[PDB]
């Protein structure tokens, strides 16, 4: 079982953790997901409506429901942002990721 395989299971599991049997996420589920998995990210997002704006920009998501693919769309967004930053403003990682996420805001 790879580090990579584990990363993938984590992604799947996290989604399901929060979605529950119904199989998608609403704003509420998503909100709490982020609060727990991306701590501080939303607070430091200098915004009250932040999570709402996010949904709108997710892959396919204008009916309150978020699929795994929509969700993964979010990961892609964050991760890439992290990397583009990491690539620029540093070169070390033996969290750093936690530190970068704090600097990021949406468009």
């Amino acid at each position: 079982p790879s580090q990579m395989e584990h990363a993938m299971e984590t992604m799947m599991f996290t989604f399901h953790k929060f979605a529950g049997d119904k199989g998608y996420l609403t704003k509420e589920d998503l909100r709490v997901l982020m609060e727990k998995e991306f701590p501080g990210f939303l607070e430091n997002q200098k915004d009250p409506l932040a999570v709402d704006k996010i949904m709108k920009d997710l892959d396919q998501c204008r009916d309150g429901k978020v699929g795994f693919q929509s969700f993964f769309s979010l990961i892609a967004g964050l991760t890439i942002a992290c990397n583009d930053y990491f690539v620029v403003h540093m070169k070390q990682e033996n969290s750093t990721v936690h530190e970068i996420l704090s600097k990021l805001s949406l468009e």
Partner: peptide, 9 residues
Amino acid sequence: PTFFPRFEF
């Protein structure tokens, strides 16, 4: 083929 959001800073 998957659209994703753009985070800056």
